[PDB]
């Protein structure tokens, strides 16, 4: 798998524990994973993709906050 | 701009848990040679279940042709 990919599987669980109502900090620690990673894969590969990925994650984990 | 729309909508899909709207957006990514869209949404698809992993290699394929 490339990058994107291991991005999207974890987007996936992270949209499982929002929409099972986890605990805020288990959605900040998957979605700050998320973002961590996004920004690196971002630095080595630029791509549109990649930073709306990066955006979709720190928009959810602001949602989630709220 | 229609790069980021297509990626937005297809987490939106996936949260929602539209298959079917995934498989499409998927199809519009690959159609229209998206690879890094096409490689994310075809995840989000694979991980609902809506296609499979020998599915996922086809459309990855196809998109970079």
């Known amino acids: 798998m490339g990058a994107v ?3 999207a599987e974890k987007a996936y669980e992270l949209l499982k524990l929002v929409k099972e109502a986890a605990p805020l900090e288990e959605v900040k620690e998957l979605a700050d994973e998320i973002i961590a990673e996004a920004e690196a894969a971002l630095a080595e590969k630029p791509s549109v993709e990649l930073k709306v990925i990066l955006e979709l ?3 959810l984990l602001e949602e ?3 | 701009g229609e ?3 297509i990626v937005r909508e297809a987490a939106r899909a996936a949260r929602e848990g539209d298959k079917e709207k995934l498989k499409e957006l998927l199809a519009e990514a690959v159609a229209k040679g998206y690879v890094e869209a096409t490689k994310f949404i075809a995840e989000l698809a694979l991980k609902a279940g809506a296609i499979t992993k020998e599915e996922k290699a086809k459309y990855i394929a ?3 042709n």
């Open chain 1, 5 to 7: 990919e291991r991005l």
């Open chain 1, 57 to 59: 994650a720190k928009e």
């Open chain 1, 64 to 66: 989630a906050e709220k």
């Open chain 2, 3 to 5: 790069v980021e729309k």
């Open chain 2, 62 to 64: 196809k998109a970079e």
